Subunit: 374 residues, 2 copies
Amino acid sequence: MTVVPENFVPGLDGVVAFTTEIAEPDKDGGALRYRGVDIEDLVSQRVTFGDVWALLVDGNFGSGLPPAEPFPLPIHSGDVRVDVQAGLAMLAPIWGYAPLLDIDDATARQQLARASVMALSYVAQSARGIYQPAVPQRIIDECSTVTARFMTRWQGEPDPRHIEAIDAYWVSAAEHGMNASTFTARVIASTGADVAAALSGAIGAMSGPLHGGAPARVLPMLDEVERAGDARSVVKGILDRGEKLMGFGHRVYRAEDPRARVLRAAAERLGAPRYEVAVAVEQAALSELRERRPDRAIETNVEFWAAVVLDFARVPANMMPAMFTCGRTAGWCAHILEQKRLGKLVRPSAIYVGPGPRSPESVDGWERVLTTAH
Amino acid sequence: PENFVPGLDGVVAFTTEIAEPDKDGGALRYRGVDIEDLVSQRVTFGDVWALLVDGNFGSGLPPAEPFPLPIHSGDVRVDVQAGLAMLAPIWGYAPLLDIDDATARQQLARASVMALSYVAQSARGIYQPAVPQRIIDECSTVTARFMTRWQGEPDPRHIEAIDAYWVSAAEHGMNASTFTARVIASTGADVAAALSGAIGAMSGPLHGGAPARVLPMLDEVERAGDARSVVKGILDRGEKLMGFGHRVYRAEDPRARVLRAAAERLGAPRYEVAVAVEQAALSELRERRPDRAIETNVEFWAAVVLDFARVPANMMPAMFTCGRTAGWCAHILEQKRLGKLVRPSAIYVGPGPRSPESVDGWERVL
């Protein structure tokens, strides 16, 4: 049994695994930048998601995400995350993706872009479901952005205001430093595996409820406030019965999350019908939490306004984790390529603290083991 | 960031009670039990799966249920990565966060044995009819079921060789696939999603541990007839000698020793040449660097044993994956009970603030 080092912390909390040039969540400064470019300037100027993908991955504009080729989704599992996780892995043999170790940066960059947009197409197809006929490719070819193509392939005739909402949300959710799925993408890429395998594994980590970042589960709250007309009494009733206010908690940035601000502004600008009730809930929830526990720094989670914006765009609640996955594909691809250029296998250690040497016959249940001596 | 080393190299990420690859002490132990005891006494893979996962004997891996593999991608690794992921909706796998240990353990066993069944079906391929379940039901162990599902009528000596290999390969401490399994599990995801991602990381050529590509060497020696000449020849033409190198354990890898013994005991036809190649390779290498500890890679005898059991070279990575499912499942259950997200950090060193207009290609953005 080995001694545990004095400085050991479980979960690698606060342990630096990489340096990165991709994006800076400036929590002290209250700002988020992608390759130096402020997120507010990207969203406010309505830079489309396909261009922000290229910015994060390449470090500049000029080679946006291309449209998806026609490819009917082969997986129908009843879960969107499963469909895209399995379907992406299956791309490597049919498309001829070699291991990352065997290809140059340019080929890796092309495979990342080709697979990244197919992930969005797969999500749109899986969301539309098997009980509807597909949207013809020539209808989707009318669109001029990838986001508009995604909304058309899914909804057929989407409101242009809802297309704008998704574009704001995806840009705001594209990248945010190291997290379990970004980390998983880099670990798999560090083995030299193909890019589809890395994206597939990252989707698996994204699906975990403790990953963080998924749109908050706030729709029953906003329904409870619509029908009662009083946000503060609802907010107090939730807290007084022992429940938790979804979408609010400890600060992430110094104060307001810059992403929460752009999504509140988008919901306002695009006229989301739930906007006022959501703002009334925000005021009442911050008020109640801040006087109940005035030592804690409490702020609105961006995830609160993520759910508002997606609900506006007609995204069902059980589809919101998939929409988060779709925007984060930009950051996943940027980190995969950065990890490719790094060329270092990720390999931490483990310390053994279990039982010492012992015979099989000393282990509980050995008598219930059948072995042949033929 | 002064003398910072990326990739968590050497950083301790977990403590574990599962197994001790005591390389510097010269022994491998699964829950304290020496691997040589397990293999020499012919403990079947399904019972070692339980030992690693539970910490005790008695609740072996169950047989797979009938379930024709739905993914036929041309890549066996892809078939099982995707197929495992698809198990969660049809089987009702809730996230790890939402279930108790007994339910998680049950789901790990059910999916782990389906992975073996999927590999067996993928390797047998779609151009052959499936083996009927009633023939597979005649088997008394999971490894026997695997080789029956694949080969239809497997030689029992070949089933024994596979049992030896899979137990030798079930677990070996922290590596990229085990680490990936733990990270995914630490998010609270379902166990199929963790095994699926682990298979992705396992497929990378830098992962390490897959059976060595030594069959052309063995081919040339059995043809040319003289091992030392061939070994000299390979080194002299500038190539490297597959399956031999710097020591891994203190001296002989204990998994190498049990795999060689099993090839000898089961009468593998290639055994005599493989032994000739081993002695020649170590002698020739020990001559060229006399102050270096040189040992046979276990992966050398892995290829010999697998080739004996009629595993084609392109199916050896999947055979390695099959065995390692036991360690993956053990580590997922341990991560579950640990209940702590794996959240490392990254340090920004990129450009400072700038406007979108100043960025190359801004003239192309609409």
